Every structure is written in structure tokens, then in C-alpha cells.
């Protein structure tokens, strides 16, 4: 009902500001004062590669229903999101902007924006949470393509076209922009790396992977090409509406936050679709350290519930490596999964083993016969080879959870092995250094056992325990197996 | 004449037997203590202990070269390649005494079955000495070995089988480790390939995750290595001769392994590590012999001679890493350059892209490259992405989080993220941001003779004063010591 530039920022974000001498980081866990300071149509730097910036972008594309979901968002941030969509998108490609107010304390936060050009507002009468709220918006979407966005984003130049171009060509692609960084303190728009893919460790937390050398090198002469990501971050993405609904939408019994990104990423890949990051599509996002909103069941409890619900449906037996990494999770009940499990069989979906081998080989999987795996931790320090080969001393170095020269397995043969070099007891005398040797299934000197409730690591057939007191003066040793803190070793993944 | 078991170990080792490390830079006492036919553990994979090895293979002339070797070690080598190789596959053992102080060291072994001794009139060095032995070889196939090695069970067959199938293969065993102090025979990793950094010193690369996955099926298969260590290898004799043998004007040590490795690959052959061939070797810390030329100088001479012939333009990245090498003269190379054209031979860019892709290579419009060193510490990203603080962390010389370039666009870049001066006030933290060729805040210059790193259009220099507290800062810029930065490669 109003052209967006004629909308009044100052009247909106007006009372709802930050009174004198209050906490600026109060309601949203980002600096609201700095957010409020900025204009709705603020200038941001074009963070795209030269290759993108300078390409007649296709505009004969199917239009999209943009779904933004929010609970207690900062008016400034919400507005800036909405306007950035309208300002930077070709107008014919925006069918509508659906705002799903997920039970925000003041309905006026969302309601007032309903004045704006193509903005509809849908209020949740109770608290539904991120996933359910997104599904509502998608069901209310008129367009043939869905675009999701977090409520504190800022679309960049020609952001939408490259996303649509992908989905229009192939409906099975679920496509995400590069997530530029909006600083939570100063609110500066910072350009992010285009050399990353999304991923995870066995704890099933999202993390950004560096692109492998083999991959980068294959993309050297096509730097702005699509990136095939094993996981989407989950905040900003575009998906064909019919594909979204056919492929099961979201797990409706997930709550608040967390899990859904994992779940959908697995699902899409496993059931014949693909996931991509598009470097020419840039969308800023306010990344933050704490959650500002309430979690009904406890923060970490609900996260585990959702994560479980995903793992239990899609991961097959490899779900155990998650439970191995996060034993605590086994206690959290996750309810019924029959619908989502049948969905899987209904869709004739591939197994997780497929996903691991073809989509995310990079992810280190322990052998079915391994006893433990990962890093061997002692406080902050972790068991490091220090680049040593055969006949080498082994050491400790601060942990960097990247499994480089700090990755170890504890085998069925009872050996502590890195690659095919295994910890070997050269000399049984107390104080003697241990050496890295080639793995023999029978050497006897490289057989180890975990004792004192998986806290220690004892040399088998002996009274001797691995000991780090000698690191700074030679390397790790065997010493007489007693109550030292230097003899304490815990594996990252325990089976 | 005399069979090896009837040879008198005691009495040979006898006139030799007081610092153990002063003689050979390994524990001579422990070496001397051991039997010539010492027991060593079978360090091969199980999937090799059950292999009917084809034994209708060509024989080899084994070339062992030495200058002041330990008698115990030399003998043990010779006997190991007699005991552990099938007799019909050993045509002869050629011992090239490279002007050793007592000629009796080599001469006395002439008594042993299949052993021939050649004394070098003058000091030649390892490459020239090897060429002599190869020219004196009968046999269709050459095997080279260092004079302090110990062949393992069925070591030779897998090497020959490869060369017999395809004469262009140059094959090396996996090099088990003989302890310099203990003299214990220790089994080595089968998950390594040979390689190098831009300083052109040999190093072992841990073979990639991508590779390790592909070799699940047949784990003891040949390894295509971009470099051979250069000590133990087997090569068809005619192929050795045809492909130019060794760069004859190389001296005592070093270079030859690089030179031949490049040559073989570049001129249409292949280099392999064969995991079921196990040969032990006494690895050492410093060289026990003397260098005519002053050690570091001769290494540089040889290395240059190789680089200047085979590396094309990329020789500069070597000179960037080792600036001192641009002087100390490499002499005439016209023959070896002619050799290259004579063979046709592919360019180094080919080698880098097809044989050793994993080698991190700077863009030729970079200004500096490598890590950014301050003391033991290097410039580390600390896993931080865009909008992150950058820091210092002790240098692990292994890449990744500590890889940096200084571009023609004047920017200090890691991956596609560049160092950014967000705030010009002294003491301000610098943040890592996406690289834009037009942001003046992402621009540096190197000043005060490549020692400092100054933010361009400013009075401000990269500084580690704050590094420990939060992150690295941009600082007031003057006589600090925290502002000192050496890039490993400059150009
Ligand atoms: C570009 C760009 C954006 C990329 C950022 C990104 O991937 N964010 C994901 C990341 O989000 P996050 O920033 O930590 O969480 P955030 O507080 O932004 O919550 C997601 C959105 O849903 C809203 N929300 C949240 C919780 C809730 O109960 N109800 C809501 O309506 C909230 O207002 C916000 O707009 O992980 C989530 C896990 O479920 C989702 O997958 C998010 O999409
Ligand atoms: C199996 C197995 C072991 C393989 C180990 C290996 O590759 N060793 C190499 C490694 O050797 P190193 O142990 O550092 O050197 P080392 O002192 O053993 O010299 C190599 C050989 O040359 C001999 N030599 C040396 C100096 C000399 O003037 N004359 C010689 O004949 C020496 O006695 C020995 O037989 O690098 C060398 C660089 O030129 C060669 O490439 C060696 O072959
Ligand atoms: Mn968010
Ligand atoms: Mn040697």
C-alpha cells in the first residue's frame, strides 16, 4: 500500500529504540543502537567477484515468494532486510514478501510493515518456532519458487538472479548465496570468502569447510561457478515450491532452532536433489554468539532433540558416531518419527553411506571395528605427531580440532594409530620415550588399552601408562602408571 | 671367490673399531656389534607375504658408492643384497670407492662373491661415482643403493617386475629407518610420497586424503611419486644411458635426486615407490665427509644446475626461497640443456600441473609468498573466517592457516580473504575480510628493506604488540621489533 522509499523509518523503529543508559545488546544480542542508526536503504559494498559484477544477468525467470520468519526482531534489522529485497531484486521477480511473525511480543513489529509494497504479514497465535513458521509462509506462498531469508539480512547487488537461474534450469537444486557478514557490534557489512563449502563434524554442529586443493584447482578457471555444498547453512536459500512440498517440507515436530538445516541437507542429497552455494549471490547476515530468544525445553536440550530427530531418520547406523561424539544426546527424548521415516522409504531415498562416499567424502569416518577415534585430548593439549615419521618421537600440541597431524585411531588390534604409524613402546623402563613405528598386527610393544574409566591409556601386558611430562624434554614417554595429570588421555570419539 | 658367509666379518670390522659419532655421524659401536647377516623384522604388509613373485626377471648390477663408510655398514649392505635377493637376479655388486682414506675398506671386499671394486683416483662425489659403476655394469638393469642400507625379504622382485613390464619406470623401495643411535631396524610408513618445497630440499609428503581413498582397494599398489629420495632405486640400464645418466658436473651430494626426478617425469618416464620392496637406511643429521667447496655452496651449485636446466621460469621461486643461491656460480650447463631438447622433453609447468599439483605455487604476478615469519611465530588465521581477527602462532611450516601472499594489487591475502585495516587509530585490531582490489584499507607496502609491512597511504605498520591479548594490530609504526616480518619467498 506504499512504495518502500516513502515508508517512514523514523516513525517505525521510533519508540521501540534504546532508552538512555540501557544495555545496547539487550533484546537481540547484537548492537541495536548501531543497527537503528543505519538507513533502511543503506549503502553496502559490492562484495562480488569482478566476474559477476559485469554480466547481463538473466531476468526472464520465475518469480519468488520471499519468506522471512521472526520472533522479537529489531525493527531496524527487519525493515532493512525487507527493503534490501525490494531495492535490489528486479520488481517482477518478487511476487510477494511473506513476513511470518512467530509470536513476537508486539504484533506491531510485523503488522506495520504490511503497509509496504508487496509485504504480507502472518501472525502466529502461539509460538511455533523457526521450522514450523517457515512452513506456514511456504504454504501461503503464491509463487512457484520459494526464497527463505533470516530477519536480519541485507541482500546485495543482483543477488536474486543467480539463485533463480539455478533453480529454473533444474528444479531439484536447492541453492544458497554466500553469506556475507554483518558485524554484530558495529554493523559494518563485510565481504565473506567465496572459497568455502558448508559441512559438519560428528557432533552434528554446522561448520564451514575450506574447499579442498583438488576442488579449488578444478575451479581455478571458473572461480564464480556454483559450489556443490554437502550442507546448506540453512538461513538463506531458494527452492522450487513443488519440490519443497514433494520432498517433505520440514520436520514439523522440530522446535525453535537447530537441526532443520542438517535434516533438509541430508534429505535433499539422499533423495536425488542437490545443494549449492552460488558465489555471485551475496546476502549479508548478522552472525551472533548468543541466542536472544527463549527456548521452551532448554536451549541445548531442544537442539539435541531436533538433531536426533534428523540423525535417527537419515543417518542409518552412522547416527552412532554422533552419539559417540555427544554421548549426552542419548538421554534426550525425541518422540515419534514414523511419518518422516516413511517419507524416506516413500521417496526411495539413498542410504547415508551413499551420502558419505559421494557427497561428503572429506568427513573422516572411523572403521566399524575401531574402538575409539579422533584426537586424543589432555586438557587443551592433544596428541600430535609434530610431523614425525617412523622412528619418531610423539608429542603434544594445543588442540585445533582439524585432525591433521593430530588425528588418531584406537584399533581392534589395540593400537594407537595415525595413518599406518602406531605408538610403540621401544623401552619398558620408566621415563623411556615411545616411538612411532610401522603397524604390525602382533608387535606387542604397540598394543594399548584404556583404563580408569577411559581417562588413562595403559600399555597392555604392563604396569605402564602413556605420560606427557617428558614432552618438553624429549617427547611423550611411558612412565610408571600412577596418579599423574600427565597420564590422563580422553578420545574425542569413544565407541 | 669366497662366499659371503665364509667371509671374515671379525678382522674386517676389526681394523677400525674414541667418539662413535666423530667417525661416521652414527653410532659405530652399535653398528660394529651387529652381525653382517643380522636379523631384521619383515616390515612388509601382510598382503605381500603371500605373493608368488614371478622370478623369470632380468638380473641387475647393484651399484654401491662410498667415501669413508663404516666397514660394518658397508659389509652389512653388501651381504643383505646377496642374502635377501635371489642369486640369479644379482649379476654383480659394483663397489665404487670414492677416494676413501684406506683403500682396504673397499679392496678387501673384492674377495666376496659377485663383488667388484673400483677405486677413484681422486675425489669425485656421489653422482660421478655412480656413473662409473653404471658404465661398468653388465646386466640389463641398474640398481643403486647407499653404502649403509639393509635389504629386506623379497625386496628386489617387486622392483624388477615393474621395470621388466615397462622400461620407462624408475622404481624405489619404501625406505625403512635404521636408527642412527640404536641401529634398530624400524618399519616405515607406506602412506608417503616424495616431494619438495621451493627451497628444493627433499621432503616426504603425507599422501592426500583423496589418494588414500583411491588406494583402499589395492593398498600395496605402486605409488606414483613426483620425486625419488635418490639413494635406493632401480632403472633400466639402456634407459639410464639414453636419458642422460647424471649431470656429470655435480659434485659431492645433493641435487642429483631432484635433477633425475624432474628429467624422468618431464621426458616421458615415471617414478614409483613400491611398498612391498623394503630397504632399510641409516638416516643421519649432518654429513660425516668433507665437501670440496664448503658444503652449503656445493649443494646450491648442484641444485642450481638442475633448476636452471629443468625448471624454466619457476627457478625464480627457488631463488626467492634461497636468495643467496642467485650468486655462487653454477658453471656451464650447455650439454644438459642440449640433452633436454634432444629428448624433446615437456616443460616444468607440465610437471607441476600433472605430476606434483599439490605443490603450492605463487601466481607469477605475486610480490611475495609463503608464510609470514616473526621469530618462531608465523602469521596464522587461527581458523577465523571473514570478519575475524588475525594472529600469530608458532610456525608449523605446513601451510593452511599460515599461507599468505602479497599480491600485485598490494594486498596481504590468505585464500580469498585479505588483511584489512578497519580502524586507522593506533592500537586498532585488524580484521580479515573478503578481498576487493579497490579497497585502500586492504593495501600494504613492504618497507625498510623488506623487513616491515606498512599500510599504504598511512603512517601505520602491521604489529604483534596486541597479538596475545586479542588479535594483531595496526600500530603507530616506528622502531618496534613487534613490526618485523620476513616473507619466506620474496620476488
Ligand atoms: C545469508 C545469510 C543467512 C545465513 C545465516 C544462517 O544460515 N542461519 C541459520 C542459523 O541461524 P542463527 O543466526 O543462529 O539463528 P537466528 O537467530 O537467525 O534464527 C533464525 C531465524 O528464525 C527466526 N526464529 C528463530 C527462532 C524461533 O523460535 N522462531 C523464529 O521465528 C529468527 O528471528 C531468525 O530470523 O542456523 C539456524 C538453525 O536452524 C537456521 O538454519 C538459520 O537459517
Ligand atoms: C633404501 C634406501 C635409502 C634411501 C635414502 C636416500 O634416498 N638417500 C639419499 C640422501 O642421502 P644421505 O643419507 O643424506 O647421504 P649420504 O651421506 O648417505 O650419501 C649418499 C651416498 O653417496 C655416497 N657418497 C657421498 C659423498 C661422496 O663424495 N661420495 C659418495 O660416494 C655415500 O657414501 C652414500 O653411499 O640424499 C642424497 C642426496 O644426494 C642421495 O640422494 C641419497 O641417495
Ligand atoms: Mn540469523
Ligand atoms: Mn645415505
Author numbering:
A (entry chain A): 75 to 569
B (entry chain C): 75 to 91, 96 to 569
Paper text:
We made use of the fact that a double mutation (“BH,” I253A/L310A double mutant in GalNAc-T2) re-programmed GalNAc-Ts to accept alkyne-containing uridine diphosphate (UDP)-GalNAc analogs such as compounds 1–4 instead of the native substrate UDP-GalNAc (Choi et al., 2019).
BH-T2 indeed contains a hole that accommodates the alkyne side chain bump in UDP-GalNAc analog 1. In turn, the fact that the kcat of BH-T2/1 (0.158 s−1) is approximately 5-fold lower than the kcat of WT-T2/UDP-GalNAc (0.813 s−1) indicates that these additional interactions may slightly slow the ring distortion that is needed to mediate the nucleophilic attack (Lira-Navarrete et al., 2014).
